[PDB]
Amino acid sequence: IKSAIKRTKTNNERRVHNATIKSAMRTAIKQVEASVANNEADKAKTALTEAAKRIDKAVKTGLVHKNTAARYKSRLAKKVNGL
């Protein structure tokens, strides 16, 4: 309205791109947790590195804000410790 139309034209374009980082981060965690219902540790090890690949790059991009991601790390990490 006061020439801040340029914000909404970018805010929606960022809203698509940010959620693709966010939703793929969610699928990485469940696939690790899929290997918790599954009785596989070696599959969980390579998935933990696959999950933390997205997690560590997530705070590098935008709002995931590491103090969450530390809880995202260790909660996955004790399950591999549980196996």
Next chain:
Amino acid sequence: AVKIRLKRMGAKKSPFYRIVVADSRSPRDGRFIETVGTYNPVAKPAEVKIDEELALKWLQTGAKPSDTVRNLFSSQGIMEKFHNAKQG
């Protein structure tokens, strides 16, 4: 953001100024932390009075003033004493 700066006081026509360490987010008459002495523009002579020592402790923490405030410190050598500390 932390700008040591002036602060507008006094009557309508003849202003008065106080040199103030504060945050720029607070308004022109906004709040602050601790002040240094004075400024007088309406005197055709002198009487710009500075504490001359307390701001150097703040400059070692880092607080960038505007140049209209800063050249009063040059007139009393606060910055050049501080630049010696930066050369120290």
Next chain:
RNA sequence: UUAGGAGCCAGCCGCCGAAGGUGGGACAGAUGAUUGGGGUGAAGUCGUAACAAGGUAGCCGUAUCGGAAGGUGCGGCUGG
């Protein structure tokens, strides 16, 4: 390496979810014919109940009757 997988989104789905609708209660205010007292005003009418031993010594509480102030009943009180 002529494409599959990964991931992604459209889409639909679920919980939550504001406003809307429905329903019987709460309280708040205007209003309601008529009535019930309460004061408030020019020499209105009716009595004289108080204040004197007020012409039957008054007075509180209860009961009861009458145009109406009141009346007496019973107990209590001196400010009889």
Next chain:
RNA sequence: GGAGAGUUUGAUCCUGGCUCAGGACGAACGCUGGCGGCGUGCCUAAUACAUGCAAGUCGAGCGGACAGAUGGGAGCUUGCUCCCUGAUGUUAGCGGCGGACGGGUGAGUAACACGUGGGUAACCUGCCUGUAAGACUGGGAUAACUCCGGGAAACCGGGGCUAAUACCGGAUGGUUGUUUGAACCGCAUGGUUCAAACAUAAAAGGUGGCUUCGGCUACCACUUACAGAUGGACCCGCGGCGCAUUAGCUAGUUGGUGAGGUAACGGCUCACCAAGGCGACGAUGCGUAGCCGACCUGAGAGGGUGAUCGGCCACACUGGGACUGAGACACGGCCCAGACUCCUACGGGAGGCAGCAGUAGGGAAUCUUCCGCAAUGGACGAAAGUCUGACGGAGCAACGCCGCGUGAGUGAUGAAGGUUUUCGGAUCGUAAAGCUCUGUUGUUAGGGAAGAACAAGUGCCGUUCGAAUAGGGCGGUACCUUGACGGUACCUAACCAGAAAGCCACGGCUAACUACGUGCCAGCAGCCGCGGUAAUACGUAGGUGGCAAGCGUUGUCCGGAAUUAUUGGGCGUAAAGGGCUCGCAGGCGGUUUCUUAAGUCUGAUGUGAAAGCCCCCGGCUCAACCGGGGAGGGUCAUUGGAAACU
């Protein structure tokens, strides 16, 4: 640093009411009104809003357009037309950061919102410094651009082209997590430090110079880490209301465990299990209202108010959600509904003034649709600069405070005139006239501040990097340059008594009185009360008195009101002892001694920001106002003392 006065009565003292003198207003109204500083100026409607402006910034992030002519060349009319990319200029879009601050309003909210003191081992912080490290190697897009398509518009869709400090992979990294060791310590969770292992986790270039054309260099930006600086979130004691004709209230309520979730602790969410929690020190409820430094008042204790200026929270037409971003659930952003306004070709859309002004409307009632970014400030940028209804000033209304006037000396004749009169006079009285007088201001013409410090560019010297005396960086000084107010303040000279006073009172409170009119009528009245024919109380006139550019009335709040009495009352009959008991809770304690330190006493430390009150100076022609310094303010916290009293 503490005044009282009229009134019950035939008369007196008490008792007890109200009345009155005082002080403030963000005040309004009536009558009048000359000026100057300084300050405020929608409280009712957080009701609805025409129009313009109130937040953008970087071509040194980047592609392209866009002009350009340094020259080069072309066709000729000598009038031109060009084709290359000059210096440089413009910035739709892209991307970076800001828009969350600045600014307003006072609706909800009686609670950790705020005020005060705390705690965090339970947290966060882009833009700031300082230190530590750095900044490797690639990739795929896409806007703009066009080319079509669909739309009344709002605009939207499709196909190619393209960029970056945009976006996305690979490496290396002292983040973090995991695993296993150690060391030390706290206040339980624990915390801090050190080692090893594993796992990933980045970054960017741009500007100018120097170049061996490999690059290098400063500077800006970038990634990461440490601290400090910085604000924010959460928790906690202690404070400031009205009602008991509100006594019972709550089931995520209250507990535990685990789980998820949040930057973070948690019923914050959910499962499970338990039945607790909140309460006569007043829960729950309801009406009410933003809080605070402070403002006003009082002698103080207190009481009232919470406007402006300063702190913080909450809200942005009403309600709900959510994104990007360090930070919002976003005042001038999106999405949704609700009302309403506007447009439509009826298919669709756009809109939010409690931003500055202004208008409607409400109401007793509150202002200018100005100029300027010169100073202060912010925003971005390397800077100039740009942007600023913050702010700077101008304009309105006696709205209030303070400051100055409205002539002044002389002048008796007690002029004239007016009023009154026992007709001698009295007063309006030295008041006018006369004479003399200056010019604040009014008027005319001149002169003309400080606010303006600077930045930036030039000059050097110092230091710092540097392949370097390149080239910079800061640091010093030197030159240059910048006014909305405004020729306004101001000062200079010239001009005239010439421009300029009123309202209120006049029995007693209460300073000041007569004459006419008037006859329970007209009318006054705050109080006692005045008038049925001599009204000092009505109305008028004269004359006093009051105060002054104002005066009265009005509504408010405080005071006097010791008349809610802690300081600072009562209870035999004046208003007031419960009809009397038994008593739980709460209230209070004999004597002697030891001890303790909750109360108490006291030091030290930390803090209660600034403005304001107050102590004292200084500045404005004084004042008001403004400035400098200091005190004071806390049932405050920690710490160390004291032991009579509790």
Next chain:
RNA sequence: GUACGAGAGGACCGGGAUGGACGCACCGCUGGUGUACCAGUUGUUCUGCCAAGGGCAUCGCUGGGUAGCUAUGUGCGGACG
């Protein structure tokens, strides 16, 4: 908006269009009934059982329903003389 009227008001006479009121007719269309039509579904029995059906439960109930008779549905009717 004419004569008329001061205005306010407001025409006869004459053309065209469209309705209400009842009247005859019908089923193409909106629906209505359609108990020897089809689909689902409950209780219980029966065809040896499952499957798949049958009976009875008011057509068991509920959603549709073709022909048929129907009205509020559609046509025309009381015309011009």
Next chain:
RNA sequence: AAGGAACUCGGCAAAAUGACCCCGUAACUUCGGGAGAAGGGGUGCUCUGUUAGGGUGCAAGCCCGAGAGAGCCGCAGUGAA
């Protein structure tokens, strides 16, 4: 179908409501009630289940079936009376 008391002396008649579980309940009150007031909600099938749990028995097995999660179905889910 559209309509709802216009019908009529009048909601007469007829439809509408019903089951069990669960939430919620006013005025007044002789405190017993009023009350099942009203007002709505979930009910079927299959899987976690030879269930949680109970009864019964010596065990073996039988009966009773609480709550949820899952999911499939039709318009409907005490589908009938």
